[PDB]
Design an enzyme around this catalytic site. Sequence first.
Site, PDB file in Angstrom:
ATOM      1  CG  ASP A 118     -16.043 116.096 115.913  1.00 29.36           C
ATOM      2  OD1 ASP A 118     -16.459 115.970 114.596  1.00 29.36           O
ATOM      3  OD2 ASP A 118     -15.750 116.638 116.426  1.00 29.36           O
ATOM      4  CB  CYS A 125     -19.942 123.887 121.252  1.00 28.90           C
ATOM      5  SG  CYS A 125     -21.488 124.477 120.768  1.00 28.90           S
TER       6      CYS A 125
HETATM    7  C1  LIG Z   1     -21.158 121.023 114.765  1.00 26.75           C
HETATM    8  C2  LIG Z   1     -19.849 120.099 114.953  1.00 26.75           C
HETATM    9  C3  LIG Z   1     -20.510 119.281 116.072  1.00 26.75           C
HETATM   10  C4  LIG Z   1     -21.986 118.552 116.491  1.00 26.75           C
HETATM   11  O1  LIG Z   1     -22.844 118.553 115.476  1.00 26.75           O
HETATM   12  P1  LIG Z   1     -24.501 117.849 115.267  1.00 26.75           P
HETATM   13  O2  LIG Z   1     -24.802 118.296 113.668  1.00 26.75           O
HETATM   14  O3  LIG Z   1     -25.036 119.606 115.734  1.00 26.75           O
HETATM   15  O4  LIG Z   1     -24.324 117.307 116.326  1.00 26.75           O
HETATM   16  C5  LIG Z   1     -19.491 118.426 116.733  1.00 26.75           C
HETATM   17  N1  LIG Z   1     -18.188 118.458 115.909  1.00 26.75           N
HETATM   18  C6  LIG Z   1     -17.788 119.782 115.385  1.00 26.75           C
HETATM   19  C7  LIG Z   1     -16.043 119.818 115.090  1.00 26.75           C
HETATM   20  C8  LIG Z   1     -18.462 120.422 114.392  1.00 26.75           C
HETATM   21  O5  LIG Z   1     -17.843 121.389 114.265  1.00 26.75           O
END
Ligand SMILES: *Cc1c(COP(=O)(O)O)cnc(C)c1O
Lengths: 405, 405
Positions: A199, A363
Site C-alpha cells: 500500500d 481509517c
Molecule cells: C488514503 C490511504 C488509503 C486509501 O486511499 P483512497 O485514495 O481513499 O482509496 C489507503 N492506504 C493508505 C496508507 C492511505 O493513506
Amino acid sequence: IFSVDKVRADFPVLSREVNGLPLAYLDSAASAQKPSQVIDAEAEFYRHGYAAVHRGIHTLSAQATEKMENVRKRASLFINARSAEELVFVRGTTEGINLVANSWGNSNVRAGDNIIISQMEHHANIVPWQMLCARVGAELRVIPLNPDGTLQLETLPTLFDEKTRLLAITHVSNVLGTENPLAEMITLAHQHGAKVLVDGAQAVMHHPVDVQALDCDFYVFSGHKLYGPTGIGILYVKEALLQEMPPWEGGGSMIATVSLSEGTTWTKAPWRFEAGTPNTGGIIGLGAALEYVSALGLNNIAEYEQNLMHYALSQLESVPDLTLYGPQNRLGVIAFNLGKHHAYDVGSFLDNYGIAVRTGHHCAMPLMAYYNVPAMCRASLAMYNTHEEVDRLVTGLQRIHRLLG
Amino acid sequence: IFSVDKVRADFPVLSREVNGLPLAYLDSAASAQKPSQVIDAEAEFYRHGYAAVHRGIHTLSAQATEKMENVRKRASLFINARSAEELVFVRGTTEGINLVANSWGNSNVRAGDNIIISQMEHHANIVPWQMLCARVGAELRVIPLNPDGTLQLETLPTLFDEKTRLLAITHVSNVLGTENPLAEMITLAHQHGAKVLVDGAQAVMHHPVDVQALDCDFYVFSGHKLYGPTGIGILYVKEALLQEMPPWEGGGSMIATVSLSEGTTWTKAPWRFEAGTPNTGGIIGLGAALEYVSALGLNNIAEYEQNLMHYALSQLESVPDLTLYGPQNRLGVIAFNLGKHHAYDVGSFLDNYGIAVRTGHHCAMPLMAYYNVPAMCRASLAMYNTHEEVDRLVTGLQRIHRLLG
Ligand SMILES: *Cc1c(COP(=O)(O)O)cnc(C)c1O
Ligand SMILES: *Cc1c(COP(=O)(O)O)cnc(C)c1O
C-alpha cells in the site's frame, strides 16, 4: 534546492481564508491540494480536446487515446515499473486493493490458507482481505506493533508458513509516518512463495519509489494524495502475475469478443482490467501531477519535508502534556493527543484558528486500539507547508491546553 | 423554447478545428462535450474549496462533504427517486451494473435460475451478467430483435418463468435509438417476482426520467454522456432492496467498526457501497451538469433534438445506397452503413472532412451479429448539433459514395 514560496504560489487554495483567518492546511495526508498546472491541464483537455477514448477512428478520440496511454507510460516510469503494461488505472488505492483481492485473491487463496497484514494498516488494506478470507475460508494474520510505532518483526517466523499466500503491507503509515522495511520483508515473503502487495498511498509523494528494487508483486497509490485529481489511482502488478489474472469488472473495452451463444473472451492486460469509459479527465490531471512533482524533484521535496518535520518535532517539545505516536524518523504526518482532551475538541479549536488537521481514527481502528485511545489528531507537513504554519499549530495547542486544562 | 446558438456558445470544444476544418462532433452518444459551467465548477472547487470529504471536522472538509451530499440529493430529484439515500456514486454505468451483479446478484441468483437481457444490450449490460451466470450456475436468456430494431415482445412468455430473477434491459439503445417500453415490461417482470435493472445511459440526456413511474428496481447512468465529467455515474436502487444489499468494495468510509479480532461491521446504505475517497471533483462537476440540463429544460431539449432528427432522416434519403438500422422514431443516434463500403473507411473519410462519427461494433457485438454486419457507422444528434452539421454529413456520404463506388 527547493523554494517553498515558489511552490506555494502554484496552489490557489493556500491563499484562502477560513473562519475569517488565513488557512493553514495540515491535512494533505487525507487529500492534497492541487497546483494550477494540474487543475488547468484537466480543464484545458475538457475545453479543447475532449472525446471518448476507445481507439476511436476520429481525430479527437485518437488523440485522447494517445494522451491516456502516454500517462500510463509516464506513471510506469515514475515508479520504475519495467513496462507501461504492468499498470492499471483504478479509482484509487482502495479500488486497486479490491481488484487484487478479487481477481488474484479468489484464484490463489484457498480454504486453510493464510494472509498476513499488519496492525498499522489503513482500512483499505484490511477490509478487502477480511472479505476475501470470509469468501474462501482463509485466515487473516497480523504483524503486531511496538510502542514506538514500528512493526514487531521478530513475530514473522510464527506468521509466515507454507500456507501463507500473501503479505499486504503499508509502505508508509498514514498515522504514524513509519516507513516499513519493505525490501527485506519482501525477500522473506518470497522465500515462502508468498506474494506481496504494498500500500504505497503515503509513500509516493515523499521520495522516489522503485518497484523493481522493491520487487513487490503489487503496488497501489492514489492520485489525489499526489497533488492530482480525485477519482484516479494506479495499480502496478508484475507482468507475469497480471497476465494470468482473470477480469474483475466486466463490460466494454475489456473484451476481445462478446457472443450470447458462444460466450465472451477477454482482451490482454492491462486493458482487461479496465471496463467502460475510463476517467479520462482524471488521467490527464494525474499525468500533469506526475510532471509537476518530477520537475520539483522528489529528493528535493524529501529534503525540505524532513527539515520541516525536524523543526516541528523540536517546536512541539514546548507543548505541555502532548503525546506523540510513531517513530522519531516519521515521514509526512504527526499523530498526537493533547493532555486528556478528546481529539475532536482539540481539532475543533485548531479549525477555529484556521488550522486544518484531521481528528478521529484515520481509517485505522486497529491502530487506535493498539494505543488504547479512541482517536488522535494528525498534522500533515507536506512540501507546500511552512515553519510559520508549524508555529501556528504549536501556539494553538499551547492556547488550547491553557484554556481547557 | 430552445436556442442552439446560445447553447453552443457554452461549449468551448465546438469552436475547434480538426484536420484544418471546422469540427462537426457527431459522437455525443460515446461521450458528450461539456459546457464551461461544468468545467469551471470543478476547476473552481479545486482552486478554492478542496479538501477530503469524510465528514472531516475542519471547515473545508465539512463544506466539501455537504457539497457532495447536496449533489446526491440533486441527482435523486433529477430521476425522481423518493430519497437521496437510494443513490450510490459509481465510476459510471458499467461500474453500477457490476456492483448490482455482485452485491445483489451473488445473494439472489442461484444455480438453476435465469436472468433475461436483450439482443440490443451494450456490453456493459451483458458481461457482468455472463460473469454472474458463470459464478452461480445460472442461465442468461435473451429477448430477440425484430428487423426494425425493436424487441420481439411476443417471446416474453417463453423467457419469463418461476426461476427468472432479473430482467436487465436498456432504456434507449446506444446504436438503434430504440426506446424500450419499460413500464409495461417491468409490470410483467414484477408479476413473476423478478427485479428489473434499467440501463439508462442513453436516456437521461434526452427526456425526463422518472424511476417511481417506471417502478424499476435498479437504474444506472453515466455523467460523461450527460454533459459532465468522466469518472462519475449514478446507481439508483429502491431503498428496500439497497438496505439488504451487502457491500461490494471494502475499505474506509463504508465501515461502522473495524476489528482484527472481532471482525468488521458496515455502515448504512448508500455509504456502505462507497469505499475510499470518492471522486469529489467529478461529483461537483456532475452536479453542475444536472443544473445546466435542468435550466435548459429536458422537454425543450427533446423537442429540438426530435426536430433535428426528423430533418436528418429526411435529408439522408438523398444518399444513394444508405442502409439505416433502427426504428423511425429513434432517439439520439443514427446507425448506418454506406453501400458496401466498410464502416471504418466511411468513418475515416468523414473524419478527413472534420466530422466525428463512431464506427465499429459500438460495444454491441450481438446487435451487429443480428444484422449480419461486422460494424456500423453512427451519427449522434445531440442538443448542441445543428442542421448545418447534418448537411455536412449528408454531403460527405454522397461524396464518399461517388468516390469509392
Ligand atoms: C488514503 C490511504 C488509503 C486509501 O486511499 P483512497 O485514495 O481513499 O482509496 C489507503 N492506504 C493508505 C496508507 C492511505 O493513506
Ligand atoms: C455508454 C453506455 C454504457 C457504458 O457507460 P460507461 O460510461 O462507459 O460505463 C452502458 N450502456 C449504454 C446503453 C451506453 O450507451
